[PDB]
Each structure stands twice: as C-alpha cells, then as structure tokens.
C-alpha cells in the first residue's frame with residue numbers, strides 16, 4: 001500500500017496556487033522533470049503444501065482431527081428503546097446539513113469460514129462527501 | 136493498492152489554480168515532463184498442493200476429519216422501539232440536507248463458506264456525494 | 271506501507287503558494303528535477319509446508335487433535351434506553367452541520383474462521399468529508 005493518501009482540499013505534482021491579487025509578470029519557470037515510477041510489488045512464489053493425514057499405512061483409527069466450532073457472532077445489537085414520551089420538536093432549520101436519528105451502517109465482510117485461501121484480499125471503503133456549499 | 140486516494144476538492148498533475156484578481160503576463164512556463172509509470176504487481180507463482188488423507192494404505196477407519204460448524208452470525212439486529220408517544224414535529228426547513236430516521240445499510244459480503252479460494256478478492260465501496268449547493 | 275499520508279489542505283511536489291498581494295516579476299525559476307521512485311516490495315518466497323499427522327505407521331488411535339471453539343463475539347451492544355420523558359427541543363439552527371442521535375457504524379471484517387491463509391490482506395477505510403462551506 002504505497003500511497004494511502006488523504007489530501008485535504010487538493011493535490012498536485014507541480015502547482016501554482018496563486019489566489020489573491022498579485023501583479024506578476026516576466027517569469028520564465030523552465031521545468032525539466034523526469035518523474036519515473038516503478039512498481040514491482042507482490043511477487044508471490046509460494047509452495048503451500050498443506051495436507052492432512054498423509055499416510056496412515058497400517059490400522060490407525062483416527063477421529064475428530066479438526067473440530068472448528070460451534071460459534072456465534074451476534075455483532076450488531078443496537079437495542080435502543082428511546083422512549084422520549086413527550087416530543088415537542090419545534091425545529092426551525094437554516095441551511096444546515098442535519099442528520100437526525102439515522103443509522104449509517106457499512107458492514108463489509110469477506111473470506112469467512114474458508115478452509116484455505118491463497119492470493120490476497122482487499123477491502124477499500126470510501127465515505128460520504130456531503131458538501132452543502134450553502135450561500 | 137498503490138493510490139488509495141481521497142483528494143478533497145481536486146487533483147491535478149500540473150495545475151495553475153489562479154482564482155482571484157491577478158494581472159499576469161509575459162510568462163514562458165516551459166514544461167518538459169516524462170511521467171512514465173510502470174506497474175508489475177501481483178505475479179503469483181503458487182503451487183498450493185492442498186490435500187486430505189493422501190494414502191490410507193492399510194485398514195484405518197477414519198472419522199470426523201473436518202467438522203466446521205455449527206455456527207450463527209445474526210449480524211444486524213437494530214431492535215429500536217422508539218415509542219415517542221407524543222410527536223409534535225412542527226419542522227420548518229430551509230435549504231438543508233436533512234436525513235430523518237433513515238437506515239443506510241451497505242452489507243457487502245463475499246467468499247463465504249468456501250472450502251478453498253485461490254487468486255484474489257476485491258471489495259471497493261464508494262459513498263454518497265449529496266451536494267445540495269443551495270443559494 | 272510507504273506513504274500513509276494525511277495532508278491537511280494540500281500536497282504538491284513543487285508548488286508556488288502565492289496568495290496575497292505581491293508584485294513579483296522577472297524571475298527565472300529554472301528547475302531541473304529527476305524524481306525517480308523504485309518500489310521492489312513484498313517479494314514472498316515462502317514454503318509453508320503445513321501438515322497434520324503425517325505418518326501414523328502402526329496402530330495409533332488419535333483423537334481431538336484440534337478443537338478450536340466454542341466461542342462467541344457479541345461485539346456491538348449499544349443497549350441505550352434514552353428515556354428522556356419530557357422533550358421540548360425548540361431547536362433553531364443556522365448554517366451548522368448537525369448530527370443528532372446518529373449511529374455511524376463501519377464494521378469491516380475479513381479472513382474470519384479460515385484454517386489457513388497465505389498471501390496478504392488489506393483493509394483501507396476513508397471517512398466522510400462533510401464540507402458545509404456556508405456563507
């Protein structure tokens with residue numbers, strides 16, 4: 001993961017952020033640039049060789065080699081009564097982003113209950129922009 | 136994952152963000168650029184060799200080699216009564232993005248209960264823009 | 271993870287942030303640049319060789335070699351009654367981002383209950399921008 005970037009307003013290799021009142025003139029700004037990037041990553045050469053009970057040559061009664069489980073998860077239990085029992089909102093809004101009593105959930109799961117798993121996984125997750133940009 | 140980017144308003148390799156009042160003139164701005172990018176990633180050369188109980192040559196009674204389970208997940212249980220028992224909203228809005236009592240859920244799952252899985256998975260997830268841009 | 275960056279407003283290799291009132295002129299600004307980057311990372315050459323009970327040659331009764339479990343997680347239990355029992359909100363807002371009684375949850379899980387797992391995982395997670403930019 002080479003560039004996990006979080007630039008705030010903006011990114012740029014070569015920028016001229018000139019943004020208030022600036023009489024500027026007769027500039028030469030010669031720019032030779034050689035920005036080579038090389039990426040030679042994640043060269044897996046693996047030989048797992050994953051094996052159960054290779055050679056029971058004779059008479060070996062085997063039993064219960066791999067008991068995974070039993071198991072529960074019960075991950076998300078809000079259990080939120082919220083018995084206000086007198087609501088008088090009287091809610092005057094102006095140009096406000098306003099989230100009320102919302103349940104934003106992003107449950108991303110992968111590679112669950114898999115005996116074996118080679119190679120690789122990847123879970124990216126962007127989040128909301130939500131730009132009012134009011135007057 | 137080379138560029139997991141989150142640029143805020145904008146990205147640009149070579150930009151001129153000139154955005155207030157700026158008399159500018161007679162500029163040469165020569166730009167030689169060699170931006171080569173090379174990506175040589177994720178070269179898997181794997182030999183899993185995944186095997187159960189290769190050679191029971193003789194008389195081996197085998198039993199219960201791999202008991203996965205039993206199991207439950209029960210992931211999302213809101214259980215949200217919300218018995219207000221007197222609602223007088225009286226809700227005057229102006230140019231407001233307003234989420235009320237919404238349940239945004241994005242449940243992304245993959246590769247579940249798979250004995251074996253080679254290669255790779257990938258779960259991207261963008262989120263909402265929601266740009267009012269009011270007056 | 272080479273650049274886990276968190277730039278605040280902005281990033282740039284070669285910038286000219288000129289943003290208040292500045293008479294500037296006759297500048298030469300010659301820039302020879304050789305910004306080569308090389309990335310030769312994560313070259314796995316592994317030979318796991320992961321194996322149970324290779325050779326029971328004779329008569330060995332085996333039993334319960336690997337009992338994982340039983341187990342629970344029960345991760346998220348809000349259990350939030352919030353019985354206000356007299357709500358008089360009277361909530362006048364001006365151009366305010368306002369989150370009220372919201373439950374932002376991002377549950378990212380991966381590679382769960384997997385006997386073996388080669389290669390690599392990756393969980394990025396961006397978060398919300400939420401730029402009002404009011405008057």
Ligand SMILES: *[C@@H]1O[C@H](CO)[C@@H](O)[C@H](O)[C@H]1NC(C)=O
Pocket residue numbers: 025026161295
């Ligand atoms: C910009 O260049 C011209 C031509 O060489 C020169 O006459 C002028 O004086 C320069 N600008 C200023 C503000 O002097």
Ligand SMILES: *[C@@H]1O[C@H](CO)[C@@H](O)[C@H](O)[C@H]1NC(C)=O
Pocket residue numbers: 032033034167302304
């Ligand atoms: C520009 O940069 C390249 C790469 O280093 C170089 O080969 C070339 O000679 C340079 N040219 C000038 C005019 O500086």
Ligand SMILES: *[C@@H]1O[C@H](CO)[C@@H](O)[C@H](O)[C@H]1NC(C)=O
Pocket residue numbers: 045180315
């Ligand atoms: C991968 O491993 C095998 C086994 O030793 C070897 O013969 C081969 O040259 C390796 N290749 C690379 C690119 O590492």
Ligand SMILES: *[C@@H]1O[C@H](CO)[C@@H](O)[C@H](O)[C@H]1NC(C)=O
Pocket residue numbers: 063064067199333
């Ligand atoms: C194997 O595991 C199961 C799972 O509970 C159990 O019921 C059984 O008795 C075990 N076998 C032996 C021989 O103990």
Ligand SMILES: *[C@@H]1O[C@H](CO)[C@@H](O)[C@H](O)[C@H]1NC(C)=O
Pocket residue numbers: 025160161
């Ligand atoms: C821009 O260039 C012209 C021609 O060389 C020059 O006469 C002028 O003075 C320059 N600009 C300014 C503001 O001086």
Ligand SMILES: *[C@@H]1O[C@H](CO)[C@@H](O)[C@H](O)[C@H]1NC(C)=O
Pocket residue numbers: 032034167168169
């Ligand atoms: C521009 O850059 C390339 C790459 O380095 C180089 O071969 C070429 O000579 C350069 N030309 C000039 C005019 O700088």
Ligand SMILES: *[C@@H]1O[C@H](CO)[C@@H](O)[C@H](O)[C@H]1NC(C)=O
Pocket residue numbers: 045180
């Ligand atoms: C892949 O592995 C095999 C086994 O050793 C080897 O013969 C071959 O050269 C390897 N190839 C690469 C590109 O690594």
Ligand SMILES: *[C@@H]1O[C@H](CO)[C@@H](O)[C@H](O)[C@H]1NC(C)=O
Pocket residue numbers: 063198199202
């Ligand atoms: C194998 O596992 C099952 C799962 O509960 C169990 O009922 C059974 O008794 C097990 N076998 C032995 C021989 O214990």
Ligand SMILES: *[C@@H]1O[C@H](CO)[C@@H](O)[C@H](O)[C@H]1NC(C)=O
Pocket residue numbers: 026295296
């Ligand atoms: C900028 O360059 C011109 C031409 O050489 C020169 O006459 C002028 O005086 C310079 N600017 C200022 C403010 O002197």
Ligand SMILES: *[C@@H]1O[C@H](CO)[C@@H](O)[C@H](O)[C@H]1NC(C)=O
Pocket residue numbers: 032302303304
């Ligand atoms: C620019 O930099 C490159 C790389 O070091 C070099 O080969 C070239 O000669 C340089 N050119 C000048 C004009 O400085």
Ligand SMILES: *[C@@H]1O[C@H](CO)[C@@H](O)[C@H](O)[C@H]1NC(C)=O
Pocket residue numbers: 045315
């Ligand atoms: C990987 O390991 C094998 C086993 O010793 C060896 O033959 C091979 O040269 C190695 N390759 C690399 C690129 O390390």
Ligand SMILES: *[C@@H]1O[C@H](CO)[C@@H](O)[C@H](O)[C@H]1NC(C)=O
Pocket residue numbers: 064333334337
């Ligand atoms: C093997 O483990 C299971 C799991 O509880 C148990 O019931 C069983 O009695 C164990 N076997 C022996 C021989 O103890």
